[PDB]
Write an enzyme that holds these catalytic residues in place. Structure first.
Site, PDB file in Angstrom:
ATOM      1  N   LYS A 188      -1.762  -3.997   2.092  1.00 57.18           N
ATOM      2  CA  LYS A 188      -0.232  -3.682   2.336  1.00 57.18           C
ATOM      3  C   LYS A 188      -0.005  -2.088   1.830  1.00 57.18           C
ATOM      4  CE  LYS A 188       3.029  -5.981   0.422  1.00 57.18           C
ATOM      5  NZ  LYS A 188       3.584  -5.043  -0.311  1.00 57.18           N
ATOM      6  N   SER A 189      -0.375  -1.894   0.592  1.00 50.67           N
ATOM      7  CA  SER A 189      -0.068  -0.514  -0.037  1.00 50.67           C
ATOM      8  C   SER A 189      -0.642   0.618   0.955  1.00 50.67           C
ATOM      9  CB  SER A 189      -0.610  -0.440  -1.401  1.00 50.67           C
ATOM     10  OG  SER A 189       0.196  -1.318  -2.051  1.00 50.67           O
TER      11      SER A 189
ATOM     12  N   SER B 101       5.443   2.112 -12.706  1.00 52.05           N
ATOM     13  CA  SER B 101       5.631   1.926 -11.189  1.00 52.05           C
ATOM     14  C   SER B 101       4.985   3.330 -10.441  1.00 52.05           C
ATOM     15  CB  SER B 101       7.099   2.446 -10.822  1.00 52.05           C
ATOM     16  OG  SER B 101       7.488   2.390  -9.344  1.00 52.05           O
TER      17      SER B 101
ATOM     18  N   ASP C 191       1.518  -7.990  -9.117  1.00 54.18           N
ATOM     19  CA  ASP C 191       2.018  -8.982  -7.917  1.00 54.18           C
ATOM     20  C   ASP C 191       1.276 -10.080  -7.984  1.00 54.18           C
ATOM     21  OD1 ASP C 191       3.935  -6.963  -7.146  1.00 54.18           O
ATOM     22  OD2 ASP C 191       2.582  -5.992  -5.803  1.00 54.18           O
TER      23      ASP C 191
HETATM   24  O1  LIG Z   1       3.126   1.711  -4.469  1.00 62.03           O
HETATM   25  C1  LIG Z   1       2.634   0.729  -3.883  1.00 62.03           C
HETATM   26  O2  LIG Z   1       1.888   0.431  -2.703  1.00 62.03           O
HETATM   27  C2  LIG Z   1       3.206  -0.509  -4.564  1.00 62.03           C
HETATM   28  C3  LIG Z   1       3.727  -0.555  -5.961  1.00 62.03           C
HETATM   29  C4  LIG Z   1       3.915  -1.994  -6.545  1.00 62.03           C
HETATM   30  O3  LIG Z   1       5.362  -1.693  -6.980  1.00 62.03           O
HETATM   31  P1  LIG Z   1       6.111  -0.987  -8.309  1.00 62.03           P
HETATM   32  O4  LIG Z   1       5.746   0.613  -8.168  1.00 62.03           O
HETATM   33  O5  LIG Z   1       7.754  -1.111  -8.050  1.00 62.03           O
HETATM   34  O6  LIG Z   1       5.384  -1.427  -9.681  1.00 62.03           O
HETATM   35  C5  LIG Z   1       3.636  -3.085  -5.863  1.00 62.03           C
HETATM   36  O7  LIG Z   1       4.221  -4.227  -6.544  1.00 62.03           O
HETATM   37  C6  LIG Z   1       3.965  -2.775  -4.347  1.00 62.03           C
HETATM   38  O8  LIG Z   1       3.806  -4.201  -3.605  1.00 62.03           O
HETATM   39  C7  LIG Z   1       3.447  -1.727  -3.883  1.00 62.03           C
HETATM   40  O1  LIG Z   2       4.100  -7.260  -2.545  1.00 62.15           O
HETATM   41  C1  LIG Z   2       4.506  -7.483  -3.597  1.00 62.15           C
HETATM   42  O2  LIG Z   2       4.279  -8.529  -4.282  1.00 62.15           O
HETATM   43  C2  LIG Z   2       5.641  -6.696  -4.366  1.00 62.15           C
HETATM   44  N1  LIG Z   2       6.168  -5.623  -3.600  1.00 62.15           N
HETATM   45  C3  LIG Z   2       6.851  -5.456  -2.381  1.00 62.15           C
HETATM   46  P1  LIG Z   2       7.817  -3.999  -1.942  1.00 62.15           P
HETATM   47  O3  LIG Z   2       8.237  -3.497  -3.313  1.00 62.15           O
HETATM   48  O4  LIG Z   2       7.132  -3.245  -1.299  1.00 62.15           O
HETATM   49  O5  LIG Z   2       9.069  -4.682  -1.484  1.00 62.15           O
END
Ligand SMILES: O=C(O)C1=C[C@@H](OP(=O)(O)O)[C@@H](O)[C@H](O)C1
Ligand SMILES: O=C(O)C[NH2+]CP(=O)(O)O
Length: 445
Positions: A23-24, A168, A321
């Site tokens: 997803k990221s 974050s 997560d």
């Molecule tokens: O940068 C990213 O792709 C993400 C960072 C995380 O959030 P936080 O930055 O709030 O920790 C993660 O929990 C989210 O699903 C995706």
């Molecule tokens: O996927 C996860 O578990 C947490 N973040 C989801 P997002 O911050 O993109 O809504």
């Protein structure tokens, strides 16, 4: 509305499956592909709702996106080329798309409005809106810096050096993306490492971005603004967070042997695997290799007896997560599993610490919820766990609460019911089919 689902005890999970895309990385593939000069080609993209919303936001700003065969092809606008959106950018349930896009377009000299669903609208945006105010962006938000939010960038944004206060990756990413349209050098200082897809991918797209790590671990990330970005061929690896569900199910359900293919193994994403191995999990890392510029491997997982462990606050960012599914694994481990440094769980799709604790108790688990910690004591044989009356776990519009408790039901003596499965498609639309193929019995209402 809501669609409850119930998971029933399984006699064994078995098979080999390819897990959906990360997803990221998928969010960033649409963003960077949409911004870069020329064409970007993406294979393995996660086609869950969250990622599709980022795609629509990019199209709204001028990018052309299409799917040809199994490849998403994007015609980017070139750095500095985003066009003002006609209507609000609807990110649905996705803060990744919302927060990164606020940094990306907030520095442009036009108005942009951000909206989302009931869950996203309650989440904190101040963590990204504050650095943007420092860069000169004008912000109109609801009380507490919540959506809806309207941004209006300055004619000339100001580059900043920003030390991220919590672990974050989204805040780090938002500031770096704002830096793309800002003259001068933008610097992000990350005291605790977080997933680094933005840094790696921007470098791959040609950005003059450097990462320097002090012996004490602090990362200094420098980005030269307004530089050219070149479209790229992207091969998206399997999502390690999605992998966690069939992986933990295989460890817990007796008589299981499941292999998950092409899983992302970047260490900022593998804290759960390390933790489960410490608990006694039989997880074999097969053919570690480089693919699409990332570390990947296939994982063979077999039924294991687990023992509770103490999980240190500093491993938290690498598995933030995965706490919901880890808490479910702990429910079947011998002894207590202790997890601290969990404050960030309270600001996710749901307050995950509260949702996990409540769901565990509803299903007979002995646990103690603290302000920033969780202690879970397990019952290895699963006896007395689950909910015989069929009471439903409150998911609070959170896909991982729904998936984690459905995994629990494959193991507990009594079935586990979740009040809604409709949000699972935000990150893993294939979940039901994938688990069913391995042998899981999950009944949708
Ligand atoms: O940068 C990213 O792709 C993400 C960072 C995380 O959030 P936080 O930055 O709030 O920790 C993660 O929990 C989210 O699903 C995706
Ligand atoms: O996927 C996860 O578990 C947490 N973040 C989801 P997002 O911050 O993109 O809504």
């Amino acid at each position: 509305s809501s669609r409850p689902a119930t998971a029933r005890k399984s006699s064994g999970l078995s098979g080999t499956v390819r897990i959906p895309g990360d997803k990221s990385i998928s969010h960033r593939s649409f963003m960077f592909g949409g911004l870069a000069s020329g064409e970007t080609r993406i294979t393995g993209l996660l086609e869950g709702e969250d990622v599709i919303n980022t795609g629509k936001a990019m199209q709204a700003m001028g990018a052309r996106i299409r799917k040809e065969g199994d490849t998403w092809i994007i015609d980017g606008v070139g750095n500095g080329g985003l066009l003002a959106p006609e209507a609000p950018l609807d990110f649905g349930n996705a803060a990744t798309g919302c927060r990164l896009t606020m940094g990306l377009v907030g520095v442009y000299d036009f108005d942009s409005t951000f909206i989302g669903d009931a869950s996203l609208t309650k989440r904190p945006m101040g963590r990204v809106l504050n650095p943007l105010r420092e860069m000169g962006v004008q912000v109109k938000s609801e009380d507490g810096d919540r959506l809806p939010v309207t941004l209006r960038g300055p004619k000339t944004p100001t580059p900043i050096t920003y030390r991220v206060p919590m672990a974050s990756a989204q805040v780090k990413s938002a500031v770096l993306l704002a830096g793309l349209n800002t003259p001068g050098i933008t610097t992000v200082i990350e005291p605790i490492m977080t997933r680094d897809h933005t840094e790696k991918m921007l470098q791959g797209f040609g950005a003059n971005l450097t990462v320097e790590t002090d012996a004490d671990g602090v990362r200094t990330i420098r980005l030269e603004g307004r530089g050219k970005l070149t479209g790229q061929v992207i091969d998206v690896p399997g999502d390690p967070s999605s992998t966690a569900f069939p992986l933990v199910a295989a460890l817990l359900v007796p008589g299981s042997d499941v292999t998950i293919l092409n899983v992302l193994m970047n260490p900022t994403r593998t804290g759960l695997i390390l933790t489960l191995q410490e608990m006694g999990a039989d997880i074999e890392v097969i053919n570690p290799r480089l693919a699409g510029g990332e570390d990947v491997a296939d994982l063979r997982v077999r039924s294991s007896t687990l023992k509770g462990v103490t999980v240190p606050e500093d491993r938290a960012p690498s598995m933030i997560d995965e706490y919901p599914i880890l808490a479910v694994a702990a429910a079947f481990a011998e002894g207590a599993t202790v997890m601290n440094g969990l404050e960030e769980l309270r600001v996710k799709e749901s307050d995950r610490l509260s949702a996990v604790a409540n769901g565990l108790k509803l299903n007979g688990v002995d646990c103690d919820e603290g302000e920033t910690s969780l202690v879970v004591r397990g019952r290895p044989d699963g006896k007395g766990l689950g909910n015989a009356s069929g009471a439903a776990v409150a998911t609070h519009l959170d896909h991982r609460i729904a998936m984690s408790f459905l995994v629990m039901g494959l193991v507990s003596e009594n079935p586990v019911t979740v009040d809604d499965a409709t949000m699972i498609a935000t990150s893993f639309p294939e979940f039901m089919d994938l688990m069913a193929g391995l042998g899981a019995k999950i009944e949708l209402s």
